[PDB]
Design a protein around this ligand. Structure first.
Ligand SMILES: [Mg+2]
Ligand SMILES: [Mg+2]
Ligand SMILES: [Mg+2]
Ligand SMILES: [Mg+2]
Ligand SMILES: [Mg+2]
Ligand SMILES: [Mg+2]
Ligand SMILES: [Mg+2]
Ligand SMILES: [Mg+2]
Ligand SMILES: [Mg+2]
Ligand SMILES: [Mg+2]
Ligand SMILES: [Mg+2]
Ligand SMILES: [Mg+2]
Ligand SMILES: [Mg+2]
Ligand SMILES: [Mg+2]
Lengths: 50, 148, 135, 138, 176, 109, 199
RNA sequence: UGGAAUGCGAGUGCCUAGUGGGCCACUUUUGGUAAGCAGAACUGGCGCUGCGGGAUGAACCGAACGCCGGGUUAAGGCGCC
RNA sequence: CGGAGCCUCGGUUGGCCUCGGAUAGCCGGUCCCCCGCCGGGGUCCGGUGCGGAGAGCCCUUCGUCCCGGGAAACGGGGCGGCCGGAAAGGGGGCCGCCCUCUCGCCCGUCACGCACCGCACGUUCGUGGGGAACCUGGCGCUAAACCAUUCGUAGACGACC
């Protein structure tokens, strides 16, 4: 039978698996799309959380 | 097989599939063939069919045994009292339906014929419907060539 | 297979060679000659079931084959082993080879390129199927 | 764009069927799929024949539709379609196909030798032409 | 009846068996299109039984014989009058065909009635077959071939020898 | 020297859809793609030639690792040029999709 | 040894049935330009067929299958696998004898490609019927390398054209060479004509 | 002139187990809106029965079975599986 | 990088080194004319049941000897260099060389080879893949990983930093 009163599901299924990251250093999955008209520049950097 | 068809097929001596016998036609026998119509292919054989049926596949019922007709003495010892002393007399008594067709024909064991080479059309429906059952008249000879 | 036909041997050490048919022996085996000088096949018996008879025929009607080249002439001779015993080409066989070769060979050379044809060895290759071609 | 048309008198090469390899003339068109054709000078009885087993040739005879065989034979001879066909490249290609098909093993050997020397002569000439082409550019 | 193969035209003549009342019964004749004569005789009895108090038991076939086409090398138009049973009623039809033989035109009808109306041969009764002049034909499909200067090409010829070779280096051409 | 056999593939065994008759093999012969071209090959010897770990004798030769199962073409099969072949022992099922020599003897030409 | 087929202008299911029967007879096969393959029926109804296929997934764990490959080559690969006994050792060996490619990568780009006229769209379809492109189909269900495959295909065809003009020139010299040596090869030419090799 | 055809060797007597839940299909058929429902007639089946086909299946279609070789079939089929 | 064998695993028994494509249309030449960084378009000429054909092409092998005729001579075989290839990168061609032979191909002459006496697994890819070793010379290389210890950005234990 249907559930009596509706409710949104808990958590997001978009962040599965809820596992330990395989890398300690954050990985840039997607770099910004290159625009040839722009002057040469870098797109990322590493900092430490003070 | 239904009880009435099963009895009539036994009187014709067609107790097995692709078994063959000669039947002399008349009101008595033609109505029997109508009963077993869905179970038989029949027609009118020609002199060649009688020849080849009796030469290649001719077996005598001699002392209740199936003896191949490999000698004329086999025919003479059983049907000699009717003047039937050779395979040619036997073919003439069968083909012309002589006065002793009954004796000469019961002497012949039912012909064990092979499957029809080249296949059938449809054994479950009548010949006139495009099948194989019932009376096909002279067309039986075509069937005999492929089964003999 | 008529006398003078060029056959293709299909079995034995001589498989693939093209020989000249002489006659059928009384035992039914075929008598053929290379000739020896063209492909190194001597006067030798062979079964007709193991030859492909081509449509190439030479006229050897005027060739005299010695009457003594019979079945018993070619029958293998037993050799005893007690080391090994080897086959020795008898001097008679060499004389016999020349008698027949010295007639057939000039008849081969009357047909252009026939001698080269009998030097070559038959083989199947890519895209060549026996059922398709004419010998 | 089209050049060859099914019409009364069009001469067609029969490619497959009982009369494959023969020339017939379209005497009449029965329906979308069949034509009445005739082969008086090529040994084909007047009969119905599907368009599928036909290849149109460039020859057109002039006779009325359904004119009886006497006149299909008459127009065929006036145009000498038999020698005209054997003069086409189409007929020669068919002939070349079967000359090759009947090659005996000995014949095959002689072609293999002749091809061997011809190919070398042409190749050696091709090399010389290329070198001369080098001088012109240089 | 099965319309197997190409049909043939048969001339079937039959009558009632003679009796003391009528020692010479009249002879009835029908045009029967059938695969073989054995089927031809059977259909005859199926039709006369519909028109007369007659059946195989009380009558006999006097003559069964094929009617050969009289002008097999001529192109004709055939009008066919037929009745047939659809799923929900019976209908009379008139159809036209072009052929060389009358039996060939009837065979085209059985394939055609099966194709366009899902009609099995056991539900079709050919009543009449008449050769028709070009000026009397009604169906535009037949009439478009009444052109003494008929000409048309064969566009987009489809390769029918598709497995010889099965694998090839060059793509087929459809223009000839 | 050169090849003297026709190239054939061991397509499979004689079978229905749920019964397999391993005493008969179906051979696909190179270039034979109709039933009308199979006539040349009927009765021809067929050799399934393979190699094994242990050495074995050789007629007119010294022992090696080559082995053969002999057979012969017995009849055509279907309309597209397959032939039925019988062997002195049923072919192992590991041989499906591999080469089967078809010799040019016994010669009828 | 290997049978290299070109996927342009072939109907998906017809090529697979022929390709499946070839690998089951032990023949290695390579099919290139799997994005050039065609499917009969308009594009939208072919798109719908795949989107329905995309809805099939294990309700409790979609990671367990079915796997919905978006590359045209893998779509064709999965179609050939559908026509094989791929759960027996025999059919898996057959499936390893097949290689499928989007575009024509090396070394097959410098090799001759066969076609299957029994699967060719020009031969098998009526000219009016609608058909789809496996590439556009693939691109619109998540395939990601349509532009790069086409951009690389543009480079390949450019080189092939250069090679072809090199080949046409070598033919012109061959015809010209034959004229120059026409005298020396007359006797050899006759043998070829006499037996049909030259017309 | 053993008085229609066809086929077939018949008759007869003791002792006797298991069974006595059945169920299904063509046709006919009662009750019920109907039911893979309840109840009948005829025949044939399953039960007791494998085998080819219907992908799969008690009953459908074909055909019934000693252990084999060759040939040919039935019902069904012949893109690939 | 450059010798014998020993095992083991197999299958195979010439190669095709490439336009793009249209299919109610094509292909090849012609560039005399028009455009472009030798390529494209036009004109015209040829083919089109594709013959500049995958119904195809290339290679074709018994070996040697002797002397001829055609073919080559711009030739075969063989040690050093410059472009050239990236989608999953080339033991192709080009130029030198000092060497190396006038035989390689075709048609003839001349004879010979275990001619093993009818008989199968023959004939390649074949210096095949993998594993041990035995040698035998040339040039080179002398690392990490895991444990243990420590950290707490980590943690049930492993793992991780
Ligand atoms: Mg809700
Ligand atoms: Mg048969
Ligand atoms: Mg029934
Ligand atoms: Mg995704
Ligand atoms: Mg009880
Ligand atoms: Mg009940
Ligand atoms: Mg109950
Ligand atoms: Mg029970
Ligand atoms: Mg029972
Ligand atoms: Mg049963
Ligand atoms: Mg079902
Ligand atoms: Mg059997
Ligand atoms: Mg099936
Ligand atoms: Mg080997």
């Amino acid at each position: 039978s249907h559930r009596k009163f509706s409710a949104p599901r808990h958590g997001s299924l978009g962040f599965l698996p809820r596992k330990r990251s395989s890398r300690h250093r954050g990985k840039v999955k997607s770099f910004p799309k290159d625009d040839p008209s722009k002057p040469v520049h870098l797109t990322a950097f590493l900092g430490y959380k003070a | 097989v239904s009880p009435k068809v099963r009895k009539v097929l036994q009187l014709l001596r067609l107790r097995q599939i692709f078994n063959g016998t000669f039947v002399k036609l008349n009101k008595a026998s033609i109505n029997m063939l109508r009963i077993v119509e869905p179970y038989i292919a029949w027609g009118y054989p020609n002199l060649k069919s009688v020849n080849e049926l009796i030469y290649k596949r001719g077996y005598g019922k001699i002392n209740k045994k199936r003896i191949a007709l490999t000698d004329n003495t086999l025919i003479a010892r059983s049907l000699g009292k009717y003047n039937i002393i050779c395979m040619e007399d036997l073919i003439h008594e069968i083909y012309t339906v002589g006065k002793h067709f009954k004796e000469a024909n019961n002497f012949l064991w039912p012909f064990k014929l092979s499957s029809p080479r080249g296949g059938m059309k449809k054994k479950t429906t009548h010949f006139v419907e495009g099948g194989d059952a019932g009376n096909r008249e002279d067309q039986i000879n075509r069937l005999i060539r492929r089964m003999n | 297979i008529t006398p003078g036909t060029i056959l293709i041997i299909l079995t034995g050490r001589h498989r693939g060679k093209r020989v000249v048919f002489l006659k059928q022996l009384s035992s039914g085996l075929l008598l053929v000659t290379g000739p020896l000088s063209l492909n190194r096949v001597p006067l030798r018996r062979t079964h007709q079931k193991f030859v492909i008879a081509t449509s190439t025929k030479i006229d050897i009607s005027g060739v005299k084959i010695p009457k003594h080249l019979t079945d018993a002439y070619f029958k293998k001779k037993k050799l005893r082993k007690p080391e090994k015993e080897k086959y020795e080409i008898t001097e008679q066989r060499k004389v016999d080879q020349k008698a027949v070769d010295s007639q057939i060979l000039p008849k081969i050379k009357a047909v252009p390129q026939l001698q080269g044809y009998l030097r070559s060895v038959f083989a199947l290759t890519n895209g060549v199927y026996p059922h398709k071609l004419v010998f | 764009v089209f050049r060859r048309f099914v019409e009364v008198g069009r001469v067609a090469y029969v490619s497959f069927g009982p009369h494959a390899g023969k020339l017939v003339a379209i005497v009449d068109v029965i329906d979308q799929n069949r034509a009445l054709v005739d082969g008086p000078c090529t040994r084909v009885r007047r009969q119905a024949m599907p368009f599928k087993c036909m290849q149109l040739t460039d020859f057109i005879l002039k006779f009325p539709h359904s004119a009886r065989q006497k006149y299909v034979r008459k127009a065929w001879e006036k145009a000498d379609i038999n020698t005209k066909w054997a003069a086409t490249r189409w007929a020669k290609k068919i002939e070349a196909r079967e000359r090759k098909a009947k090659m005996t093993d000995f014949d095959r050997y002689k072609v293999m030798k002749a091809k061997k020397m011809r190919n070398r002569i042409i190749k050696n000439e091709v090399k010389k032409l290329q070198r001369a082409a080098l001088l012109k550019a240089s | 009846m099965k319309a197997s193969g190409t049909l043939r035209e048969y001339k079937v003549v039959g009558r009632c068996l003679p009796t003391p009342k009528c020692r010479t019964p009249p002879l009835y004749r029908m045009r029967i299109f059938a695969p073989n004569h054995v089927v031809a005789k059977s259909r005859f009895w199926y039709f006369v039984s519909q028109l007369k108090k007659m059946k195989k038991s009380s009558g006999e076939i006097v003559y069964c014989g094929q009617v050969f086409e009289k002008s097999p090398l001529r192109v004709k138009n055939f009008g066919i009058w037929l009745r047939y049973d659809s799923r929900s009623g019976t209908h009379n039809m008139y159809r036209e065909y072009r052929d060389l033989t009358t039996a060939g035109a009837v065979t085209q009808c059985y394939r055609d009635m099966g194709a366009r109306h899902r009609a099995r041969a056991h539900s079709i009764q050919i009543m009449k077959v008449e050769e028709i002049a070009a000026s009397k034909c009604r169906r535009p499909a037949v009439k478009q071939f009444h052109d003494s200067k008929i000409k048309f090409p064969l566009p987009h010829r489809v390769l029918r020898r598709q497995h010889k070779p099965r694998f090839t280096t060059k793509r087929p051409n459809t223009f000839f | 020297s050169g090849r003297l056999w026709c190239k054939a593939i061991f397509a499979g065994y004689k079978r229905g859809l749920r019964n397999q008759r391993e005493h008969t093999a179906l051979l696909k012969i190179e270039g034979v793609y109709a039933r009308d071209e199979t006539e040349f090959y009927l009765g021809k010897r067929c050799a399934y030639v393979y190699k094994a770990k242990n050495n074995t004798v050789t007629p007119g030769g010294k022992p090696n690792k080559t082995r053969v199962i002999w057979g012969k073409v017995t009849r055509a099969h279907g309309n597209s040029g397959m032939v039925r072949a019988k062997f002195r022992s049923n072919l192992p099922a590991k041989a499906i999709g591999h080469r089967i020599r078809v010799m040019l003897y016994p010669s009828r030409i | 040894q290997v049978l290299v087929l070109d996927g342009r202008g072939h109907l998906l299911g017809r090529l697979a049935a022929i390709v499946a029967k070839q690998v089951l007879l032990g023949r290695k096969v390579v099919v290139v330009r799997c994005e050039g393959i065609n499917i009969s029926g308009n594009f939208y109804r072919n798109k719908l067929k795949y989107l329905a296929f995309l809805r099939k997934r294990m309700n409790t764990n979609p990671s367990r299958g079915p796997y919905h490959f978006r590359a045209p080559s893998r779509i064709f690969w999965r179609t050939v696998r559908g026509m094989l006994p791929h759960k027996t050792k025999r059919g898996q060996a057959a499936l390893d004898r097949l290689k499928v490619f989007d575009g024509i990568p090396p070394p097959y780009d410098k090799k001759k490609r066969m076609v299957v006229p029994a699967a060719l769209k020009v031969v098998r379809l009526k000219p009016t019927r609608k058909f789809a492109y496996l590439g556009r189909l693939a691109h619109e269900v998540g395939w990601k390398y349509q532009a790069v495959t086409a951009t690389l295909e543009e480079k390949r065809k450019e080189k092939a054209k250069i090679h072809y003009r090199k080949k046409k020139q070598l033919m012109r010299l061959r015809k010209q060479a034959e004229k120059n040596v026409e005298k020396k090869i007359s006797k050899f030419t006759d043998v070829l004509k006499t037996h049909g090799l030259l017309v």
